[PDB]
Write an enzyme that holds these catalytic residues in place. Structure first.
Site, PDB file in Angstrom:
ATOM      1  N   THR A   1     -28.897 -53.862  12.189  1.00  0.00           N
ATOM      2  CA  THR A   1     -28.675 -53.120  13.619  1.00  0.00           C
ATOM      3  C   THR A   1     -29.952 -53.489  14.514  1.00  0.00           C
ATOM      4  OG1 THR A   1     -29.441 -51.277  12.299  1.00  0.00           O
ATOM      5  CG2 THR A   1     -27.137 -51.351  13.279  1.00  0.00           C
TER       6      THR A   1
ATOM      7  N   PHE B   1     -29.605 -43.077  17.023  1.00  0.00           N
ATOM      8  CA  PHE B   1     -29.972 -42.841  15.589  1.00  0.00           C
ATOM      9  C   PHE B   1     -29.166 -41.920  14.592  1.00  0.00           C
ATOM     10  CE2 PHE B   1     -33.456 -45.511  17.592  1.00  0.00           C
ATOM     11  CZ  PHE B   1     -33.429 -46.563  17.037  1.00  0.00           C
TER      12      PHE B   1
ATOM     13  N   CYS C   1     -30.971 -41.482  11.162  1.00  0.00           N
ATOM     14  CA  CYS C   1     -31.613 -42.747  10.419  1.00  0.00           C
ATOM     15  C   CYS C   1     -33.025 -42.800  10.244  1.00  0.00           C
ATOM     16  CB  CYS C   1     -31.605 -43.957  11.530  1.00  0.00           C
ATOM     17  SG  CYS C   1     -32.243 -45.537  11.109  1.00  0.00           S
TER      18      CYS C   1
HETATM   19  C1  HEM Z   1     -31.798 -50.288  16.013  1.00  0.00           C
HETATM   20  C2  HEM Z   1     -31.827 -50.026  14.835  1.00  0.00           C
HETATM   21  C3  HEM Z   1     -30.889 -49.011  14.024  1.00  0.00           C
HETATM   22  C4  HEM Z   1     -29.974 -48.371  14.352  1.00  0.00           C
HETATM   23  C5  HEM Z   1     -29.408 -48.178  15.786  1.00  0.00           C
HETATM   24  C6  HEM Z   1     -29.487 -47.303  13.401  1.00  0.00           C
HETATM   25  C7  HEM Z   1     -28.716 -46.390  13.422  1.00  0.00           C
HETATM   26  C8  HEM Z   1     -28.289 -45.512  12.410  1.00  0.00           C
HETATM   27  C9  HEM Z   1     -27.351 -44.328  12.401  1.00  0.00           C
HETATM   28  C10 HEM Z   1     -26.603 -44.107  13.723  1.00  0.00           C
HETATM   29  C11 HEM Z   1     -27.462 -43.846  11.381  1.00  0.00           C
HETATM   30  C12 HEM Z   1     -26.587 -42.477  11.052  1.00  0.00           C
HETATM   31  C13 HEM Z   1     -25.455 -42.917  10.106  1.00  0.00           C
HETATM   32  C14 HEM Z   1     -24.320 -41.857  10.102  1.00  0.00           C
HETATM   33  O1  HEM Z   1     -24.572 -40.841  10.572  1.00  0.00           O
HETATM   34  O2  HEM Z   1     -23.373 -42.180   9.384  1.00  0.00           O
HETATM   35  C15 HEM Z   1     -28.437 -44.438  10.552  1.00  0.00           C
HETATM   36  C16 HEM Z   1     -28.915 -43.978   9.143  1.00  0.00           C
HETATM   37  C17 HEM Z   1     -29.441 -44.578   8.440  1.00  0.00           C
HETATM   38  N1  HEM Z   1     -30.419 -45.771   8.602  1.00  0.00           N
HETATM   39 FE1  HEM Z   1     -30.448 -46.654  10.672  1.00  0.00          FE
HETATM   40  N2  HEM Z   1     -30.417 -47.630  12.114  1.00  0.00           N
HETATM   41  C18 HEM Z   1     -31.300 -48.605  12.559  1.00  0.00           C
HETATM   42  C19 HEM Z   1     -32.174 -49.222  11.938  1.00  0.00           C
HETATM   43  C20 HEM Z   1     -32.503 -48.939  10.555  1.00  0.00           C
HETATM   44  C21 HEM Z   1     -33.745 -49.478   9.770  1.00  0.00           C
HETATM   45  C22 HEM Z   1     -34.717 -50.307  10.283  1.00  0.00           C
HETATM   46  C23 HEM Z   1     -33.450 -48.756   8.443  1.00  0.00           C
HETATM   47  C24 HEM Z   1     -34.283 -49.120   7.485  1.00  0.00           C
HETATM   48  C25 HEM Z   1     -35.532 -49.549   7.343  1.00  0.00           C
HETATM   49  C26 HEM Z   1     -32.356 -48.043   8.481  1.00  0.00           C
HETATM   50  C27 HEM Z   1     -31.910 -47.174   7.466  1.00  0.00           C
HETATM   51  C28 HEM Z   1     -31.015 -46.131   7.415  1.00  0.00           C
HETATM   52  C29 HEM Z   1     -30.607 -45.246   6.524  1.00  0.00           C
HETATM   53  C30 HEM Z   1     -31.256 -45.448   5.044  1.00  0.00           C
HETATM   54  C31 HEM Z   1     -29.700 -44.404   6.939  1.00  0.00           C
HETATM   55  C32 HEM Z   1     -28.946 -43.084   6.225  1.00  0.00           C
HETATM   56  C33 HEM Z   1     -29.949 -41.829   6.384  1.00  0.00           C
HETATM   57  C34 HEM Z   1     -29.668 -40.848   5.342  1.00  0.00           C
HETATM   58  O3  HEM Z   1     -28.425 -40.397   5.849  1.00  0.00           O
HETATM   59  O4  HEM Z   1     -30.277 -40.435   4.585  1.00  0.00           O
HETATM   60  N3  HEM Z   1     -31.904 -47.980   9.899  1.00  0.00           N
HETATM   61  N4  HEM Z   1     -29.128 -45.395  11.165  1.00  0.00           N
HETATM   62  N1  LIG Z   2     -28.623 -48.062   9.962  1.00  0.00           N
HETATM   63  C1  LIG Z   2     -27.981 -48.627   9.565  1.00  0.00           C
HETATM   64  C2  LIG Z   2     -27.005 -49.232   8.868  1.00  0.00           C
HETATM   65  C3  LIG Z   2     -26.628 -50.367   9.348  1.00  0.00           C
HETATM   66  C4  LIG Z   2     -25.503 -50.962   8.575  1.00  0.00           C
HETATM   67  N2  LIG Z   2     -25.114 -52.117   8.747  1.00  0.00           N
HETATM   68  O1  LIG Z   2     -25.467 -52.671   9.806  1.00  0.00           O
HETATM   69  O2  LIG Z   2     -24.142 -52.602   8.210  1.00  0.00           O
HETATM   70  C5  LIG Z   2     -24.932 -50.411   7.376  1.00  0.00           C
HETATM   71  C6  LIG Z   2     -25.503 -49.098   7.127  1.00  0.00           C
HETATM   72  C7  LIG Z   2     -26.553 -48.565   8.023  1.00  0.00           C
HETATM   73  O3  LIG Z   2     -26.988 -47.183   7.586  1.00  0.00           O
END
Ligand code: HEM
Ligand SMILES: N#Cc1cc([N+](=O)[O-])ccc1O
Ligand code: NI
Length: 451
Positions: A264, A389, A396
């Site tokens: 992402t 996020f 996130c």
């Molecule tokens: C612009 C970059 C990113 C965007 C737009 C983004 C967006 C999101 C969104 C919308 C969710 C919620 C998903 C849901 O509700 O089903 C999420 C969860 C998560 N993201 Fe990201 N993300 C980004 C970058 C990252 C990065 C850099 C990491 C790790 C270093 C990461 C790791 C995770 C993890 C592990 C979750 C699950 C958190 C939990 O439910 O405990 N993401 N992200």
């Molecule tokens: N964030 C973030 C995210 C991105 C992807 N993805 O890019 O496929 C999958 C799972 C994730 O939780």
């Protein structure tokens, strides 16, 4: 409740038989409004697009994170990692507590030098291009973000800038994700015509898990003191249970963070550069900030924090094209949505983030314009109006990591190069559960500032 066109038996399922289903759903939302029902054989969901309704959906006392059909499919390789766990699975809160300190201010300062290491490799690549050579933007942003999560998280070098073709992990990741998105429109998923889609899927999962195996081995055989994300996976104890993660969960977390931690962010960087070259006055303003703030050979942590307008550019890119464009919720109890739509316990909702971000009652009439100034004062944005996020305790975990990396890299790009929309690119958004420009190229003319 409004509902888009149906196909007999199949109800709405054939509407997802497209390579761009999120953009299809956005067009349906434009036609039908803030809520619409979407039915498939044996499943129903309600797509929400207005801040009025999404603010209620984000009430964690009433709704919890749902695993959509898409997430259940990718749970085949993400397992019960953080992203594909239910909030109530023991491993969710355990891993959440263990891994959250890997994203503290102290941790972020510790990642900064390694982020610079990869950012400098990107800048050097572009500085070394000959005249008239193109830059393949999403491809190089994916080189940068994959290498960054590999080094910062796992002390592992993917060395993506040493390859002209994508890293084998990337090729399998993309096919596995695209297979999951393509499996959502299959009316009969066990049809024998998809039995080598299923072969290919398992091979791609093995490719990813082999890489995970190497990262674990390298850490095991390493004579260097790391204190990174993998250190916490392997050693950290949950303060509530007192327990560490077990080996099977650790493997799922590594795959989860390698993918989530780069894909992402590569999309975001690609969309941001697209909007900058399409909006030259905005590009000029961002470049002036980069030149004013980035006065040293490499950026410091504090300087990246001072790149206010670059940060605004990134948030405005996430407003128009949030690169993880939808998240799913279910009703914890019977409840009424918006004073108008009764829901039963278990009913599913889908938050369509790009449409939320085009809510004219929040943002005004010019929602399609790229105007970073909308984020001059973040406090002016109403609750649950801007959700790239996600929401609440399931938001996130990597948000600050992504924004710091993207701000650093875009700052250095703006300091070091002038950019040309060389081919008058027509935005083409590829969907693989996440969103990214496809085929976006620029040319970059060095301002010849040494590194
Ligand atoms: C612009 C970059 C990113 C965007 C737009 C983004 C967006 C999101 C969104 C919308 C969710 C919620 C998903 C849901 O509700 O089903 C999420 C969860 C998560 N993201 Fe990201 N993300 C980004 C970058 C990252 C990065 C850099 C990491 C790790 C270093 C990461 C790791 C995770 C993890 C592990 C979750 C699950 C958190 C939990 O439910 O405990 N993401 N992200
Ligand atoms: N964030 C973030 C995210 C991105 C992807 N993805 O890019 O496929 C999958 C799972 C994730 O939780
Ligand atoms: Ni630590």
């Amino acid at each position: 409740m409004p509902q888009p066109k149906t196909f007999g038996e199949l109800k709405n399922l054939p509407l997802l038989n497209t390579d761009k289903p999120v953009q299809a759903l956005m067009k349906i939302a434009d036609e039908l409004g803030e809520i619409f029902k979407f039915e498939a054989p044996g499943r129903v969901t309600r797509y929400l697009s207005s801040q009025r309704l999404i603010k209620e959906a984000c009430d964690e006392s009433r709704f919890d994170k749902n695993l959509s059909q898409a997430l259940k499919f990718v749970r085949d390789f993400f397992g019960d990692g953080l992203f594909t766990s239910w909030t109530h699975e023991k491993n969710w809160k355990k891993a959440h507590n263990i891994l959250l300190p890997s994203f503290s201010q102290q941790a972020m300062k510790g990642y900064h030098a390694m982020m610079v290491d990869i950012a400098v490799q990107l800048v050097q690549k572009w500085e070394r291009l000959n005249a008239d050579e193109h830059i393949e933007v999403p491809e190089d942003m994916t080189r940068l973000t994959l290498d960054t999560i590999g080094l910062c998280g796992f002390n592992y070098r993917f060395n993506s800038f040493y390859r002209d073709q994508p890293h084998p992990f990337i090729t399998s990741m993309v096919r596995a994700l695209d297979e999951a998105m393509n499996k959502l429109q299959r009316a009969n998923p066990d049809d024998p015509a998809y039995d080598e889609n299923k072969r290919q899927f398992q091979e791609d999962i093995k490719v990813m898990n082999d890489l995970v195996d190497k990262i674990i081995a390298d850490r095991k055989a390493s004579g260097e003191q790391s204190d990174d994300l993998l250190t916490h996976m392997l050693n950290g104890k949950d303060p509530e249970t007192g327990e560490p993660l077990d080996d099977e969960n650790i493997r799922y977390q590594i795959i989860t963070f390698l993918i989530a931690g780069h894909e992402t962010t590569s999309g975001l960087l690609s969309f941001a550069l697209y909007f900058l070259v399409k909006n030259p006055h905005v590009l000029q303003k961002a470049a002036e900030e980069a030149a004013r703030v980035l006065v040293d050979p490499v950026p410091s942590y504090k300087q990246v924090k001072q790149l206010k307008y670059v940060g605004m550019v990134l948030n405005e890119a996430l407003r128009l094209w949030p690169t993880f464009p939808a998240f799913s919720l279910y009703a914890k109890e019977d409840t009424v949505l918006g004073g108008e739509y009764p829901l039963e316990k278990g009913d599913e909702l889908m938050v369509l983030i790009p449409q939320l971000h085009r809510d004219k009652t929040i943002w005004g009439d010019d929602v399609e314009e790229f105007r970073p100034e909308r984020f001059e004062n973040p406090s002016a944005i109403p609750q649950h109006a801007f959700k790239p996020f996600g929401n609440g305790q399931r938001a996130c975990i990597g948000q600050q990591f992504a924004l710091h990396e993207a701000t650093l890299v875009l700052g250095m790009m703006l300091k070091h190069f002038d950019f040309e929309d060389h081919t008058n690119y027509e935005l083409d958004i590829k969907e693989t559960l996440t969103l990214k420009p496809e085929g976006f190229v620029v040319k970059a003319k060095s301002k010849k500032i040494p590194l």
